[PDB]
Amino acid sequence: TRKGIIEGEPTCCFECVECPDGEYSDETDASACNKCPDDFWSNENHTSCIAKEIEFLSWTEPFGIALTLFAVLGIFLTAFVLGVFIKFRNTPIVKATNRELSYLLLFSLLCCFSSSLFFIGEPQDWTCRLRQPAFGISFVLCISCILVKNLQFLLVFLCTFMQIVICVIWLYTAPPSSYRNQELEDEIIFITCHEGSLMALGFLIGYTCLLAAICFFFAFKSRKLPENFNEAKFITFSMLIFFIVWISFIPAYASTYGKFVSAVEVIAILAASFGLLACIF
Amino acid sequence: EAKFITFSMLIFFIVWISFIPAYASTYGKFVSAVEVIAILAASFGLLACIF
Amino acid sequence: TRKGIIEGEPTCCFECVECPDGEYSDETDASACNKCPDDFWSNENHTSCIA
Ligand SMILES: COc1cccc([C@@H](C)NCCCc2ccccc2Cl)c1
Ligand SMILES: [Ca+2]
Ligand SMILES: [Ca+2]
């Protein structure tokens, strides 16, 4: 507490007044309350300084363990599919479905599933730098590989090179960085990332969504050919799932406040990937 | 009508799974906004898929 | 703002300390800041409280 003034009476007479939040009194007969040191907050008794709680999406939360379980299951399923394809090689269907392109697609799907682990845990600097470009490049490679499905590799590498060059331009000009946000609550510090260049993120998302749209159009144009077990139908379905996932992702990200924002991405990515894999494999 | 029922169920499930995090950590009008959006999306998906 | 004791000095000598949030003072030469009523809150200038 701190000493008050009964106006009209001498200085030897005072009244004790409670020190407010963000202030404390650690001395007998104090006149003013000291402000807490930065990254510290007054306790309930207003006499000492507890540490401000650091908040992020941890691995101990049930949400984190659930997302990790789903990601590991996706990785296992992709590896299982790749092993089955490589074991039953030189067979009619596998050789009919462009073995090499299928292997590249499965590797890129493994990359897509592994790229979701950068959005979980305390965000360090390199994780914030590698969060978006990994998924962007991997999914662009996936989409191009499906679209193409030698000359094929030359065709497939160009879109990935475009994505790589825009990503490296982004990282050279203004890279993201970690941020210890202190505005959302006076007793909690939220550790997040911060995309330095919004234009690069928008361009990356738009390029991916344009490739998806082109693939969807070419799949719907040929939705009745029965070649290769009628893969056009399932490519159409995969593109539809992708578009639904991201169109529903927009409001989910817009409405979320706090750490759980990261969660939504770890959801959306996974969902999209899963759909794709199933419909094609 | 197998395809349409399956797609409607997918729309419903994807919408709610995506909106779970927003429901877990939000207080205010955005809760009602999420409710209305998730109801309208499901109803529109069902109608469009079926009829 | 409110009066603040300077230790070892007579009552006529004091300091001016700004009132914190949720409390206000609407007079000159104030000793203790008041408390805004229920459903009110002090303004930025802390000269009154609005609903
Ligand atoms: C086309 O689909 C994608 C292509 C690249 C990245 C992604 C996901 C992983 N992040 C979206 C970025 C969402 C966003 C928008 C504005 C401000 C901050 C943020 Cl964080 C999706
Ligand atoms: Ca007197
Ligand atoms: Ca004296």
Curated annotation (Swiss-Prot), chain C:
Domain of life: Eukaryota
Tissues of expression: Expressed in the temporal lobe, frontal lobe, parietal lobe, hippocampus, and cerebellum. Also found in kidney, lung, liver, heart, skeletal muscle, placenta.
Physiological role: G-protein-coupled receptor that senses changes in the extracellular concentration of calcium ions and plays a key role in maintaining calcium homeostasis. Senses fluctuations in the circulating calcium concentration: activated by elevated circulating calcium, leading to decreased parathyroid hormone (PTH) secretion in parathyroid glands. In kidneys, acts as a key regulator of renal tubular calcium resorption. Ligand binding causes a conformation change that triggers signaling via guanine nucleotide-binding proteins (G-proteins) and modulates the activity of downstream effectors.
UniProt record similarity statement: Belongs to the G-protein coupled receptor 3 family.
Record PTM text: Ubiquitinated by RNF19A; which induces proteasomal degradation.
Residues listed as glycosylation sites in the UniProt record: 45
Cystine pairs: 19-33, 36-49
Disease: Hypocalciuric hypercalcemia, familial 1: A form of hypocalciuric hypercalcemia, a disorder of mineral homeostasis that is transmitted as an autosomal dominant trait with a high degree of penetrance. It is characterized biochemically by lifelong elevation of serum calcium concentrations and is associated with inappropriately low urinary calcium excretion and a normal or mildly elevated circulating parathyroid hormone level. Hypermagnesemia is typically present. Affected individuals are usually asymptomatic and the disorder is considered benign. Hyperparathyroidism, neonatal severe: A disorder characterized by severe hypercalcemia, bone demineralization, and failure to thrive usually manifesting in the first 6 months of life. If untreated, NSHPT can be a devastating neurodevelopmental disorder, which in some cases is lethal without parathyroidectomy.
Subunit organization: Homodimer; disulfide-linked. Interacts with VCP. Interacts with ARRB1.
Region (Cysteine-rich (CR)): 1-51
Free-text domain note: The extracellular regions of the homodimer interact in a side-by-side fashion while facing opposite directions. Each extracellular region consists of three domains, LB1 (ligand-binding 1), LB2 and CR (cysteine-rich). The two lobe-shaped domains LB1 and LB2 form a venus flytrap module. In the inactive configuration, the venus flytrap modules of both protomers are in the open conformation associated with the resting state (open-open) and the interdomain cleft is empty. In addition, each protomer contains three anions, which reinforce the inactive conformation, and one calcium ion.
Compartments, as annotated in UniProt: Cell membrane
Protein name in the entry: Extracellular calcium-sensing receptor
Binding site for Ca(2+): 8
Species the sequence originates in: Homo sapiens (Human)
Complete-protein stretch covered: 550 to 600 of 1078
